[PDB]
Design an enzyme around this catalytic site. Structure first.
Site, mmCIF file in Angstrom:
data_model
loop_
_atom_site.group_PDB
_atom_site.id
_atom_site.type_symbol
_atom_site.label_atom_id
_atom_site.label_comp_id
_atom_site.label_asym_id
_atom_site.label_seq_id
_atom_site.Cartn_x
_atom_site.Cartn_y
_atom_site.Cartn_z
ATOM 1 N N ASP A 35 -128.888 13.842 -16.137
ATOM 2 C CA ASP A 35 -127.795 13.889 -17.118
ATOM 3 C C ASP A 35 -127.248 12.482 -17.363
ATOM 4 O O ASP A 35 -126.478 11.966 -16.555
ATOM 5 C CB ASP A 35 -126.691 14.795 -16.558
ATOM 6 C CG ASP A 35 -125.470 14.850 -17.452
ATOM 7 O OD1 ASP A 35 -125.694 14.645 -18.696
ATOM 8 O OD2 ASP A 35 -124.380 15.171 -16.983
ATOM 9 N N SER A 198 -124.979 4.082 -34.058
ATOM 10 C CA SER A 198 -126.071 4.249 -35.017
ATOM 11 C C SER A 198 -125.655 3.636 -36.346
ATOM 12 O O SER A 198 -124.480 3.705 -36.737
ATOM 13 C CB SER A 198 -126.394 5.731 -35.157
ATOM 14 O OG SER A 198 -127.308 5.956 -36.222
HETATM 15 C C1 LIG Z 1 -119.808 18.833 -25.339
HETATM 16 S S1 LIG Z 1 -121.188 18.532 -24.154
HETATM 17 C C2 LIG Z 1 -121.783 20.134 -23.613
HETATM 18 C C3 LIG Z 1 -122.934 19.881 -22.617
HETATM 19 N N1 LIG Z 1 -123.535 21.178 -22.334
HETATM 20 C C4 LIG Z 1 -124.589 21.616 -23.048
HETATM 21 O O1 LIG Z 1 -125.060 20.966 -24.014
HETATM 22 C C5 LIG Z 1 -125.212 22.905 -22.568
HETATM 23 C C6 LIG Z 1 -126.358 22.565 -21.602
HETATM 24 C C7 LIG Z 1 -126.829 23.757 -20.816
HETATM 25 C C8 LIG Z 1 -127.789 24.619 -21.342
HETATM 26 C C9 LIG Z 1 -128.252 25.693 -20.628
HETATM 27 C C10 LIG Z 1 -127.776 25.943 -19.359
HETATM 28 C C11 LIG Z 1 -126.762 25.167 -18.857
HETATM 29 C C12 LIG Z 1 -126.330 24.057 -19.578
HETATM 30 N N2 LIG Z 1 -125.705 23.686 -23.712
HETATM 31 C C13 LIG Z 1 -124.808 24.271 -24.558
HETATM 32 O O2 LIG Z 1 -123.593 24.137 -24.375
HETATM 33 N N3 LIG Z 1 -125.277 24.898 -25.652
HETATM 34 C C14 LIG Z 1 -124.395 25.512 -26.538
HETATM 35 C C15 LIG Z 1 -124.917 25.418 -27.941
HETATM 36 O O3 LIG Z 1 -126.204 26.020 -28.059
HETATM 37 C C16 LIG Z 1 -127.121 25.195 -27.209
HETATM 38 C C17 LIG Z 1 -126.697 25.287 -25.800
HETATM 39 C C18 LIG Z 1 -122.450 19.281 -21.303
HETATM 40 O O4 LIG Z 1 -121.379 19.638 -20.813
HETATM 41 N N4 LIG Z 1 -123.277 18.428 -20.715
HETATM 42 C C19 LIG Z 1 -123.056 17.859 -19.402
HETATM 43 C C20 LIG Z 1 -124.269 18.105 -18.470
HETATM 44 C C21 LIG Z 1 -124.635 19.614 -18.332
HETATM 45 C C22 LIG Z 1 -125.896 19.711 -17.456
HETATM 46 C C23 LIG Z 1 -126.348 21.162 -17.250
HETATM 47 C C24 LIG Z 1 -125.241 21.946 -16.634
HETATM 48 C C25 LIG Z 1 -123.966 21.869 -17.452
HETATM 49 C C26 LIG Z 1 -123.523 20.396 -17.688
HETATM 50 C C27 LIG Z 1 -122.801 16.348 -19.486
HETATM 51 O O5 LIG Z 1 -123.826 15.683 -20.227
HETATM 52 C C28 LIG Z 1 -121.446 16.132 -20.148
HETATM 53 O O6 LIG Z 1 -120.405 16.632 -19.705
HETATM 54 O O7 LIG Z 1 -121.492 15.416 -21.281
HETATM 55 C C29 LIG Z 1 -120.216 15.171 -21.994
HETATM 56 C C30 LIG Z 1 -119.688 13.854 -21.514
HETATM 57 C C31 LIG Z 1 -120.595 15.099 -23.481
#
Ligand SMILES: CSC[C@H](NC(=O)[C@H](Cc1ccccc1)NC(=O)N1CCOCC1)C(=O)N[C@@H](CC1CCCCC1)[C@@H](O)C(=O)OC(C)C
Length: 329
Positions: A35, A198
């Protein structure tokens, strides 16, 4: 030294990517989500509340190299509202053959429900800047930061696949993994992220608009989150697309042929194929699909997540002044 590891989508939607990580002596192999949007290496553990474990766990008492970091604790929450917390060990961690000794391994005492619910993710390996690490009282360095002294070059590369395996490399650039040349762009670490600007975008075969888009390269985010005006311009070229309040974003007919989306990296251009912007059906068999490009208004940050990054070979240059490189592939 170098390392090279295979990263695999966790599901048929490319929701996230997992990469094997060896922790401890003898090695305990866990599949972690690499990540670039966070800076903690934390794992499901023998310490995690049993009812919250469904994952492979790290057992520090089975590792001869594990050391408790006395008095240290951690607690994190992510953009999607998930969270975890616990205590801290140092241990030997290897990724793709690259070994770091004394890496902080944050052992979860508790994890939130989405972590329990996701059998495929055994924890996180954060690759943002170490200033975002959540260990207290003293923050801990990322795996990349600890590896830099030994690496052949202070770089890692992300080569994520579209519904396919890909690669994370540490310490070298594989010149066979991309086409053309890499264009590098400046990084600001003021918010601890791989944050860059970008130079603009184009939709399909239309004109490139020079408009600065400040955002982050985040391997841990599924989708491409961009300014509302940019996202509206994209979906205006998809005749069935509409914003759905109940689904939570733009939705469109799965049968649509979507336009590409191009983003600028300096003078260079990365083209995301239309198919990559089809995230998939809202439910199995639905005629409606969720868009892979969505507004960043609700998050407050533009995020070049996996929809974008998997269209490129991406170089995370961790020299003292960091930069970010993109190449087509
Ligand atoms: C507004 S950023 C939202 C981002 N989460 C995501 O993008 C999650 C990832 C995931 C998928 C499947 C299973 C578990 C987790 N996917 C998600 O929210 N989605 C919703 C929309 O449809 C697509 C899937 C996120 O929180 N990313 C984290 C790392 C992530 C790793 C996997 C476990 C959960 C946490 C991190 O990059 C972060 O906090 O970024 C911020 C700073 C933007």
């Amino acid at each position: 030294s170098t390392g090279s590891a295979t990263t695999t989508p966790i599901d048929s939607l490319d929701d996230a990517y997992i990469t094997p990580v060896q922790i401890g002596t003898p090695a305990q192999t866990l599949n972690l989500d690499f990540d670039t949007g966070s800076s903690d290496l934390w794992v499901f553990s023998s310490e995690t509340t049993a009812s919250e474990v469904x994952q492979t766990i790290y057992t520090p008492s089975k590792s001869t190299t594990a050391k408790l970091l006395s008095g240290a604790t951690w607690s994190i929450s992510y953009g999607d509202g998930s969270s975890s917390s616990g205590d801290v060990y140092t241990d030997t961690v290897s990724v793709g053959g690259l070994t770091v000794t004394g890496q902080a391994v944050e052992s979860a005492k508790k994890v939130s429900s989405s972590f329990t619910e996701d059998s495929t993710i055994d924890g996180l390996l954060g690759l943002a800047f170490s200033t975002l690490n959540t260990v207290s009282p003293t923050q801990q360095k990322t795996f990349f930061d600890n590896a830099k002294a030994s690496l052949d070059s202070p770089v890692f590369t992300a080569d994520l696949g579209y519904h396919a395996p890909g690669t994370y490399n540490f310490g070298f650039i594989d010149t066979t993994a991309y086409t053309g040349s890499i264009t590098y762009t400046a990084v600001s670490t003021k918010q601890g992220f791989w944050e860059w600007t970008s130079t603009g975008y184009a939709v399909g075969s239309g004109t490139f608009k020079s408009t600065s888009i400040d955002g982050i390269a985040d391997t841990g985010t599924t989708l491409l989150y961009l300014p509302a005006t940019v996202v509206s311009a994209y979906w205006a070229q998809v005749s069935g697309a509409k914003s759905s309040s109940s689904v939570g974003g733009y939705v469109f007919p799965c049968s649509a042929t979507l336009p590409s989306f191009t983003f600028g990296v300096g003078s260079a251009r990365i083209v995301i194929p239309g198919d990559y912007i089809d995230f998939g059906p809202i439910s199995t068999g639905s005629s409606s699909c969720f868009g892979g490009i969505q507004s960043s208004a609700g998050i407050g940050i533009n995020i070049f997540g996996d929809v974008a990054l998997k269209a490129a070979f991406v170089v995370f240059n961790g020299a003292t002044t960091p930069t970010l490189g993109f190449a087509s592939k």
